[PDB]
Amino acid sequence: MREIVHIQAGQCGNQIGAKFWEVISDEHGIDPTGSYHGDSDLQLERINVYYNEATGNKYVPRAILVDLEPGTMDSVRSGPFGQIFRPDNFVFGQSGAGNNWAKGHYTEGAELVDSVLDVVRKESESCDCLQGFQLTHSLGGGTGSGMGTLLISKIREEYPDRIMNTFSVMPSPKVSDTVVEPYNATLSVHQLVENTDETYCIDNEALYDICFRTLKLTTPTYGDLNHLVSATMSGVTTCLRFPGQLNADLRKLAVNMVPFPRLHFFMPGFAPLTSRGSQQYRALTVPELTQQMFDSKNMMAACDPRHGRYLTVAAIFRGRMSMKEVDEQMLNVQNKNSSYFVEWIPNNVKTAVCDIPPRGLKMSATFIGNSTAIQELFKRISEQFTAMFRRKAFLHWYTGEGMDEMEFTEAESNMNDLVSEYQQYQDAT
Amino acid sequence: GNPNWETAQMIREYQSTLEFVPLLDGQAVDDHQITVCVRKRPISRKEVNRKEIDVISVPRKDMLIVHEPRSKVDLTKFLENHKFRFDYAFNDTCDNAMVYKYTAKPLVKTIFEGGMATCFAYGQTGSGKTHTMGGEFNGKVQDCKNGIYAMAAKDVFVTLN
Ligand SMILES: CC(=O)O[C@H]1C(=O)[C@@]2(C)[C@H]([C@H](OC(=O)c3ccccc3)[C@]3(O)C[C@H](OC(=O)[C@H](O)[C@@H](NC(=O)c4ccccc4)c4ccccc4)C(C)=C1C3(C)C)[C@]1(OC(C)=O)CO[C@@H]1C[C@@H]2O
Ligand SMILES: Nc1ncnc2c1ncn2[C@@H]1O[C@H](COP(=O)(O)OP(=O)(O)NP(=O)(O)O)[C@@H](O)[C@H]1O
Ligand SMILES: Nc1nc2c(ncn2[C@@H]2O[C@H](COP(=O)(O)OP(=O)(O)O)[C@@H](O)[C@H]2O)c(=O)[nH]1
Ligand SMILES: [Mg+2]
């Protein structure tokens, strides 16, 4: 079978995985020690996709934690699952990027990437055959912006034909948590357009609206924000782990969901999402989940999908279902909302049916769309970018680290072409 | 050897956009009873070998400007015109030693006119001021025929005569 290498960059990224790796082990029934105590054996059938075996019945997650620049490190070790990682995989350095891109990609990355790329090739040859390189990081910051994109330039070079997903937490257009946030967006995405197969563009403001308007929560903590993102990750590799009546490879997604080799910037989605005690006044069916998935306030993208056009969508369904109901609900949406989509594409929807739901639920789903509604987001960042650069605002923290003025002009016109060539296809042609 | 040559590119632009009224030691240096004059030493052969850059303009007879390189808030080079209105602005090239005579002429009168005609020599180390009052004017071995005091200590006996 195929196996997946999992990489974490940035202060954001490993905090995502710290909840996420708890979810996968609870999806199979694995202790903090690695002792398997699941219920059935059906979850044992694809342990190998993430977990390799150890000496006495122990399973080790193949997670290479690049981002443990030492302050972030001990928290991961002093967590719920600090006693589950192989401690030699904690690959890190000292005196980090400091929310500087060039300190992530040009100066301190060169003093760490040789210690990283070797550990990549360690877990690589322990696999039968590879496809999976799940980088978990954010844009906007430091390590996730400069040290994250450094590996994607390198691991593509050693592995030219492997599936490359980066579940990058994008910047927010209103809540700016970083002063240099447009300067880290334009540079890091300039790597991502060149050498990614897909990416899950995620905002926190979309996570803010979902936790508050839909889940009705008072105080959303970052463990609870990312638990929404952790639901996306396990839903996609559901079929590469569980037997489904219409399976879903990452590459089955990564041939269907992408028309053109550059336009592979995805927005995720998830359902069910509700606020209750234990009595909730609804009923789980196929059209129950379907209407929830296609909602403009149920996006993890922070954009109106009705403003843009859906190029293509992906309905990855879990749990026991019925294909005709699955087929016709995807049919009825493309009928009643045909003016929304890209009209000159024959089918605008595909399906994917796993046969096993998660633990608590009885049915579930995972929306993955690719739209010209994400044309808004880079427009909401490149305008923030181009106001800083004309006044030449933060250059002396970048030119004094090994960068150049001609690099910035080269950086945005890459991003200026995406919003240009999303306007070609949001237009009715 | 090779400092920033664009330093000098900054200099020459102010030069070729204006009039310049130089000043030499071949003119009647009029009287005011008071002044503060200027005279610089020539650029040495060593400084040329090290590519020392010009720093002065002599735009006028009674004014001088310094060429100071500076930097802005984006590390962009800036040049300052230290506009110094003075009385007498002589060049380092025009040292014919009549500067003392042109300085002595008003003073050689005063004491003989019954007055107190004084002076002072002010300058930096290595600025050529021992070559400016203590003499002698050759710049090689201080040849004992051009004692700069003697250019009016002659007057002490000659204007006496
Ligand atoms: C009585 C009952 O049915 O309770 C549900 C529940 O009330 C709701 C509200 C759950 C609840 O989820 C949340 O409140 C939540 C908290 C942080 C981040 C995201 C969600 C639930 O906590 C979450 C929990 O989810 C699971 O058990 C899934 O297997 C889920 N597991 C985890 O996320 C997980 C949490 C802690 C430790 C280990 C795993 C999962 C989802 C996708 C992929 C893998 C696992 C469920 C169904 C419930 C509770 C318990 C209240 C909901 O979430 C999920 C993920 O199912 C929130 O909206 C759904 C709808 C559910 O009905
Ligand atoms: N106006 C001038 N024209 C030509 N050569 C000059 C002039 N002034 C000084 N020099 C030469 O510059 C050199 C240094 O001059 P000098 O008068 O010895 O300097 P200084 O100011 O007395 N230095 P110092 O005694 O070390 O504090 C000598 O070789 C001079 O002959
Ligand atoms: N979703 C999420 N975003 C985070 C988290 N921590 C930081 N961020 C975001 O990540 C960006 C800051 O980068 P960060 O990862 O902390 O910097 P780094 O350690 O230099 O990579 C900002 O956009 C923050 O809003 C997190 O735990 N979850
Ligand atoms: Mg001397």
> DSSP string spanning A195-224?
H-SEEE-B-HHHHHHIIIIIS--SS--HHH
The answer to whether A393 faces chain B, any CB pair under 8 Å, is: no
The answer to whether A73 faces chain B, any CB pair under 8 Å, is: no
CATH architecture of A1-259: 3-Layer(aba) Sandwich (3.40)
**A138 in contact with ligand 3, CB cutoff 6 A:** yes
CB A143 within 8 Å of CB A9 = yes
What is the Cα A84 distance to its own chain's centre? 23
CB A245 within 8 Å of CB A45 = no
CA of A273 to the centre of ligand 1 (A): 9
Rounded to whole angstroms, the Cα distance separating B83 from B64 reads 6
Rounded to whole angstroms, the Cα distance separating A144 from A97 reads 9
Tell me the three state secondary structure of residue A76: helix
Q: Are strands B77-81 and B84-85 parallel, antiparallel or unpaired?
A: unpaired
**A221 in contact with ligand 1, CB cutoff 6 A:** no
**B134 in contact with ligand 2, CB cutoff 6 A:** no
Cβ-based neighbour number of residue B6 at 10 Å: 10
CA of B100 to the centre of ligand 4 (A): 19
Where are the domain boundaries for CATH 3.30.1330.20 in chain A? 260-373
Rounded to whole angstroms, the Cα distance separating A150 from A133 reads 14
Ion ligand 4 neighbours, Cβ < 5 Å: B 130
**Residue in A390, A392, A404, A405 to test binding to B, most B beta-carbons within 10 Å:** A392
Q: Which ligand has its closest atom nearest to the C-alpha of B139?
A: 2
B76: CB partners within 8 A, 6+ apart:
none
Where are the domain boundaries for CATH 3.40.50.1440 in chain A? 1-259
Q: Output phi, psi for A62, to 5 deg.
A: -80, 80
Cα dihedral A278→A284→A290→A295 (10° resolution): -20
Distance, in angstroms, between B74 CA and closest chain A CA? 7
CATH topology of domain A260-373: 60s Ribosomal Protein L30; Chain: A; (3.30.1330)
A129: CB partners within 8 A, 6+ apart:
A1, A2, A3
Instruction: Tell me the structure's resolution in angstroms, rounded to a single decimal.
Output: 4.0
b/e per residue B30-45 (b: at least 16 CB within 10 A): eeeeeeeebbbbeeee
**A276 in contact with ligand 1, CB cutoff 6 A:** yes
**A26 in contact with ligand 1, CB cutoff 6 A:** yes
CA of B66 to the centre of ligand 4 (A): 25
Query: What CATH number matches the domain at A374-429, 3.90.1170.40, 1.10.287.70, 1.20.1250.20, 1.10.287.600?
Result: 1.10.287.600
The residue whose C-alpha atom lies closest to atom 53 belonging to ligand 1 is A273
Rounded to whole angstroms, the Cα distance separating A382 from A10 reads 22
Q: Are strands A2-8 and A129-136 parallel, antiparallel or unpaired?
A: parallel
Residue A77 corresponds to which amino acid? Answer: R
Q: Are strands A363-371 and A265-271 parallel, antiparallel or unpaired?
A: antiparallel
A-B interface: how many C-beta pairs under 8 angstroms? 5
Where are the domain boundaries for CATH 1.10.287.600 in chain A? 374-429
A265: CB partners within 8 A, 6+ apart:
A199, A201, A370, A374, A418
CB B132 within 8 Å of CB B121 = yes
Q: Which two tokens stand for residue A249?
A: 């490879």
The answer to whether A396 faces chain B, any CB pair under 8 Å, is: yes
Cis peptide before A3 (omega within 30 of 0): no
What residues pair up with A366 in beta bridges, in sequence order? Answer: A270, A316
Of B48, B91, B130, B132, best ligand 2 pocket probe by most atoms within 8 Å of the beta carbon? B130
The residue whose C-alpha atom lies closest to atom 26 belonging to ligand 2 is B126
Tell me the three state secondary structure of residue A255: helix
CA of A338 to the centre of ligand 3 (A): 38
Rounded to whole angstroms, the Cα distance separating A269 from A235 reads 10
